Design a protein around this ligand. Structure first.
Ligand SMILES: Nc1ncnc2c1ncn2[C@@H]1O[C@H](COP(=O)(O)OP(=O)(O)O)[C@@H](O)[C@H]1O
Ligand SMILES: [Mg+2]
Lengths: 208, 220, 308, 220, 217
RNA sequence: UAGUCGGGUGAUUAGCCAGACUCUAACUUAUUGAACGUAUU
């Protein structure tokens, strides 16, 4: 469509990808260059032209938090506090959100993880549901990718829906473009205190 | 597996194809399909089912198409719930069936008497000869026993306990209520057994014995 | 009575109006409109007969609307909304969740009962007909779920009315602490020159929403955004520049200049030409100075030729 | 198995403790405190006496039930006698000792108790002024709770003759005592442990200068 | 160094740890856990970034809870710098209880809970104090709200009390101040920081008093 | 420093030039309906 063409020629990634999907060269190359283009800085380090990071996180009636907002740094964010302040809760919340990108890079319409109805809703919350809202950035052509994970408490009649389609839409671009021509893919990883484990060399995973 | 799962439970899931072992290594399309067509009389000449699996990271998901099998299995399940019907048997006997016999036979919890125990591990490859032995001994005990003698005995015990409570011993009221519950449960089980339109244990025993002796030449 | 009024306006019989209204909540066509990025929005429009009735209803019955309400108002719009905030350095935007579909008959009648300003009084017998006029039934089998549809001609008026008391209270509260407040449909905008007063507004909003609507209307917490002159500030798609003037924004202006340049060399197709002309009318409304500059840059003759 | 005295030696030197065993044992203690065993014996004695009178009155059908109840009574008396014979702290006292120890040593925990929620027993804690389940605790709080709870359980079981069983003898090894602890807790942890368990020989490892600021150089 | 040996007839990964060749099973828990983190992360980056000259310069988000887990203070002083150098385009989101770690990080990167929060705080913020390059003792007090000395030990208060006694007796060492001085000397020792501070207090107060007398005359 | 605003240039959604701004802090959105601007009558 002419509207998508205008936005795509303006540098909008989602519009370029939509045009590629309907006409299925020009638009493919726009999408692939958006993901692959970068430069080597003065220090000899490669820098992508379009950076990918978590911008902002909001927690509503999640575990100890009634309503909390966090702005994150593009490079390094360190969270400090006494025991029981919710530092681990914050990383758990982010990891669950990232699970939706991973699931959809692996499989079209893949399912990410969920908030627990048994443990994750704040105990004294009058409204018996929790929300974890995240906004991701992917260069100036995709400045905001909002995701919301939601869960109602066990036995509540009204169920609160998660909103995960933007994550799926972005992950679809990575998956589809990669299938046609190899691209570099983002790494997502969580290292919690479970990383401390006794080693066993003899135990092999025979699964994949 | 998809028929068995859906006869047992609404929305039951059968078994999936493995992404690691079931897909051909040099498949250009990077997915696998197992397509089956079943027949069920002239009214249902074609019941197609497809099990599918795609490799990780493919641009499109290949999902299974299992609704026709579920629809048919739902007919069997729902109609059976209202009025007992005969049900299809599915079984797989692999080379695994050659395994040594554990002699020491396990206490009958009473899962073996349930009709849909017939679908337990039915496509696992070995059969469950242990389950047979338990069930067969169970059948024997019931045949030697009288039916509702426990109910008659329980009825007599509840009557004796009722007389004691009527005689002024209020301390045994709790025990009477427990025994009345046991009696009601026994009657219900008897009625459910009666309601399930099942063959007598003596007849079941006879059928199986005849089958074994007919098919297995050395066993008389 | 409502029936008699409608019949008179539409020059129809009481009986034919009444008969039509029996299934009016189901007389909606449902279709999709593409979003500007990926995806679609789902819209429900009333059938023609019902639209006529809805328009007649709105004509017959005037419901109060607060001055802070900028959307769907005769003689007002996005320019007026943006202009209200142009002189203030700090900006807060908030948004309501599923605004139209959150408004039910129950909310509507509660608002009628609660209303400070003089609402029309309806006979109990008319209440059922009014519900059938104004509310859509999305689920065929569930007769009990009636909601406002954005695609209906009456929905703007009813929604503004339902927000009347809300607007009254928040407007009054903001005025005491020197905050400017306006509402464009589900979009709430707050601006001030005083540092560190806008931080309290979201909490105030939540309390007020709960008080007036319980759990029916809620803030979209993900869409609550703070801004200042240090950052980009826009109100209903109009940019406020650092000289406290309304602007189309640099990127939009550059795009228009691109299109004009293409036209100058006869490279614009008819569709794009039409597009350009429409955009220039809007630009003339928001930023007339921009048109002056384009005339200076491109020859008055070129621009007149384009707009002729 | 968890109520047996020498269960206190089960997996003592395996490294993790058995916090699961604590929870089981603690719920058990709670259930026994809500229900006295001698009243059950008195009630069972009364039931046996009532059943004996019925058998003496000519109802031979209840003789089987009488024999079963006599067996149950004998078992209850034996348990009571074994409990009496073990010269043990009452279940109420045991519960109290452990609760006090936990609350004294673990700074964020002010109270611990067993609730009957729905149809399953749950241990609840007042953590940082809020009532939470064990599964809701932070890793630092849970790990430290686990250590102290386990140790207290074992000491109560092994020192039945002491007025304060936590004043018993023993050797306890702790690797990385500061594990998961904020600096504020590190300033209290050694003091709290030594106060609660005054006769235990502690051999510990640490990386924390904050911990070392609370200890004499002779111990290092 | 890290390498694979097969010669024994089983595949063994070996490392040179502090100059000694050992198996992975022989590593301390601290070393193994940290090795595991870095190894895992590197493997994933190499696999996901085949077109980069340096695959560790790929994009991603990595979350690490308790970065100081099992690390000696010496390692805590290096860990963030090493990670950021090896993975320059990853967004790291970290939790820590370590002032030593915080001493290597800019205040802008730090998000601090308010001390008496109770979970109705709207927004997290940075500390007021600059942490990068700051003294450990200052970070403990200003950022982590922990006293330099353990409050539950009497000896932790002696220097403070000694100072108060000096100020109460117009700067002269009285019987009470002398007793406490001797206690400090006896407990901490002749070359202790605490005693030197006490000595300093005596000297400064004597000089202040001399000034006061000269001014009075 | 960075981000933002944008007057000018520039076959012009790019790049380049000039000037400025900084409450912890914009992410440009939606039709056929409604309103507003334009065109037509
Ligand atoms: N559902 C819940 N409702 C209320 N409080 C909760 C809930 N879940 C956890 N908590 C509380 O949250 C804290 C958990 O802290 P945690 O997320 O582990 O962070 P940290 O690692 O900083 O301790 C504890 O104070 C715990 O009591
Ligand atoms: Mg239009």
């Amino acid at each position: 469509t002419k509207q998508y063409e205008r936005k795509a020629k303006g540098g909008n990634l989602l519009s370029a990808f939509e045009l590629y999907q309907r006409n299925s060269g020009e638009w493919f190359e726009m999408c692939r260059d958006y993901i692959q283009d970068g430069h080597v800085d003065e220090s000899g380090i490669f820098r992508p032209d379009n950076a990918f990071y978590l911008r902002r996180l909001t927690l509503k009636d999640f575990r100890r938090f009634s309503l909390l907002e966090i702005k994150l740094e593009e490079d390094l964010t360190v969270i400090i506090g006494n025991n029981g302040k919710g530092k681990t809760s914050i990383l758990y919340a982010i990891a669950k959100t990232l699970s939706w990108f991973v699931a959809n890079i692996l499989k079209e319409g893949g399912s990410g993880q969920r908030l627990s109805e048994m443990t994750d809703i704040k105990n004294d919350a009058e409204d018996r549901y929790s929300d974890v809202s995240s906004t991701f950035f992917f260069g100036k052509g995709l400045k905001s990718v909002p995701i919301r994970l939601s869960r109602s408490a066990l036995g509540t009649a009204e169920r609160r829906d998660s909103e995960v389609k933007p994550a799926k839409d972005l992950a679809d671009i990575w998956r589809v473009i990669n299938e046609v021509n190899t691209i570099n893919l983002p790494t997502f990883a969580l290292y919690n205190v479970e990383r401390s484990q006794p080693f066993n060399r003899n135990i092999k995973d025979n699964t994949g | 597996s998809w028929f068995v799962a859906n006869i047992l439970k609404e929305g039951g899931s059968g078994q999936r194809l493995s992404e690691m072992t079931d897909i051909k290594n040099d498949a250009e399309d990077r997915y696998s399909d197992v397509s089956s067509t079943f027949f069920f009389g002239k009214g249902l000449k074609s019941v197609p089912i497809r099990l599918s699996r795609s490799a990780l990271g493919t641009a499109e998901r290949r999902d299974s198409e299992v609704k026709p099998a579920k629809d048919l299995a739902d007919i069997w399940r729902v109609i059976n719930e209202v009025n007992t019907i005969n049900l299809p048997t599915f079984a797989l006997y692999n080379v695994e069936r050659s395994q040594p016999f554990n002699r020491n036979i396990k206490d009958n919890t009473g899962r073996r008497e349930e009709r849909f125990d017939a679908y337990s591990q039915t496509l696992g490859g070995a059969g469950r000869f242990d389950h047979f032995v338990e069930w067969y001994i169970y059948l024997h005990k019931r045949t030697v026993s009288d039916i509702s003698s426990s109910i008659k005995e329980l009825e007599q015990q509840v009557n004796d306990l009722q007389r004691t409570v009527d005689g002024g011993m209020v301390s045994v009221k709790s025990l009477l209520e427990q025994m009345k519950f046991k009696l009601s449960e026994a009657i219900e089980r008897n009625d459910a057994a009666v309601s399930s339109r099942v063959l007598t244990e003596s007849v079941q025993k006879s059928i199986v014995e005849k089958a074994i002796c007919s098919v297995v030449p050395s066993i008389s | 009575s409502v029936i008699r009024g409608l019949a008179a306006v539409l020059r129809q019989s009481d009986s034919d109006i009444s008969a039509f209204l029996v299934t009016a909540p189901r007389k909606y066509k449902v279709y999709k409109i593409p979003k500007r990025t990926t995806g679609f929005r789902v819209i429900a429009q009333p059938a023609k007969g019902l639209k006529d009735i809805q328009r007649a209803f709105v004509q017959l019955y005037s419901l109060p609307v607060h001055d802070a309400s900028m959307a769907y108002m005769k003689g007002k719009g996005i320019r007026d909304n943006a202009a209200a905030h142009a002189g203030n350095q700090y900006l807060l935007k908030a948004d309501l969740e599923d605004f139209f579909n959150s408004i039910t008959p129950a909310i509507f009648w509660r608002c009628i009962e609660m209303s400070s300003a003089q609402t029309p009084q309806f006979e109990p017998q008319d209440k059922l007909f009014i519900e059938k006029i104004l509310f859509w039934q999305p689920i065929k089998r569930r007769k009990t779920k009636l909601i406002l549809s954005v695609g209906a001609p009456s929905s703007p008026v009813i929604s503004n009315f339902c927000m009347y008391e809300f607007d009254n209270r928040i407007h009054a509260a903001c005025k005491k602490v020197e905050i400017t407040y306006t509402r464009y449909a589900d979009d709430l905008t707050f601006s001030s020159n005083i540092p560190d007063v806008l931080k309290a507004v979201p909490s105030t909003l939540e309390v007020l929403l709960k008080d007036l609507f319980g759990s029916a209307l809620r803030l979209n917490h993900s869409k609550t955004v703070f801004s200042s002159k240090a950052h980009n500030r826009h109100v209903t798609g109009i940019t406020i520049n650092n000289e406290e003037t309304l602007s189309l924004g640099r990127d939009r202006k550059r795009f228009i200049k691109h299109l004009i340049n293409q036209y100058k060399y006869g490279l614009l197709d008819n569709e794009d030409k039409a597009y350009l002309i429409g955009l220039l009318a809007f630009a003339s409304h928001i930023e007339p100075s921009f048109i002056t500059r384009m005339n200076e840059k491109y020859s008055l003759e070129l621009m007149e030729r384009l707009r002729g | 198995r968890r109520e047996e005295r020498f269960d206190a030696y089960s997996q003592t030197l395996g490294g993790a403790g058995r916090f699961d065993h604590f929870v089981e044992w603690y719920i058990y203690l709670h259930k026994r405190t809500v229900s006295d065993i001698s009243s059950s014996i008195k009630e069972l004695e009364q039931q046996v006496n009532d059943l004996q009178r019925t058998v003496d009155g000519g109802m031979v059908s209840v003789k089987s039930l009488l024999e079963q109840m006599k067996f149950k009574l004998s078992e209850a008396i034996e348990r009571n006698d074994a409990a009496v014979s073990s010269r043990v702290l009452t279940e109420s006292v045991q519960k109290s000792i452990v609760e006090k120890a936990i609350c004294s040593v673990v700074p964020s925990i002010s109270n611990i108790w067993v609730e009957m929620i729905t149809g399953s027993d749950l241990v609840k804690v007042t953590n940082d002024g809020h009532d939470v389940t064990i599964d809701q605790l932070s890793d630092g709080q849970r790990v430290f709770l686990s250590l102290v709870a386990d140790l207290a359980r074992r000491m109560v079981m092994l020192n039945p003759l002491l007025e304060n069983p936590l004043e018993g003898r023993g050797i306890v090894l702790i690797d990385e005592i500061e594990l998961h602890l904020h600096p504020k807790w590190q300033q209290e942890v050694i003091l709290n442990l030594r106060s609660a368990f005054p006769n235990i020989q502690f051999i510990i490892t640490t990386h924390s200068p904050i911990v070392l600021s609370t200890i004499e150089k002779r111990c290092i | 160094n890290i390498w694979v040996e097969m010669i024994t007839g089983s595949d063994l990964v070996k490392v040179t740890n502090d100059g000694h060749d050992v198996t992975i099973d022989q590593l301390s828990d601290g070393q193994r856990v940290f090795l595991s983190l870095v190894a895992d992360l590197a493997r994933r980056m190499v696999m996901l970034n085949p077109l980069l000259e340096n695959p560790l310069e790929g994009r991603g988000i990595v979350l690490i809870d308790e970065i100081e887990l099992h690390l000696h203070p010496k390692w805590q002083q290096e860990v963030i710098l090493n990670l950021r150098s090896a993975f320059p385009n990853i967004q790291f989101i970290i939790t820590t209880h370590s002032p030593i770690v915080l001493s290597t990080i800019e205040k802008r990167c730090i998000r601090e809970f308010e001390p008496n929060d109770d979970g109705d705080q709207s927004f997290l913020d940075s500390p007021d104090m600059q942490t990068k390059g700051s003294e450990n003792a200052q970070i403990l007090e200003q950022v982590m709200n922990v006293h330099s000395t353990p409050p539950g030990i009497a000896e932790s208060h002696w220097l403070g009390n000694f100072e108060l006694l000096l100020l109460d007796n117009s700067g002269e060492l009285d019987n009470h101040s002398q007793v406490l001085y001797d206690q400090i000397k006896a407990h901490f020792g002749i070359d202790s920081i605490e005693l030197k501070k006490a000595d300093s207090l005596i000297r400064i107060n004597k000089m202040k008093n001399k000034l006061n007398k000269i001014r009075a005359e």
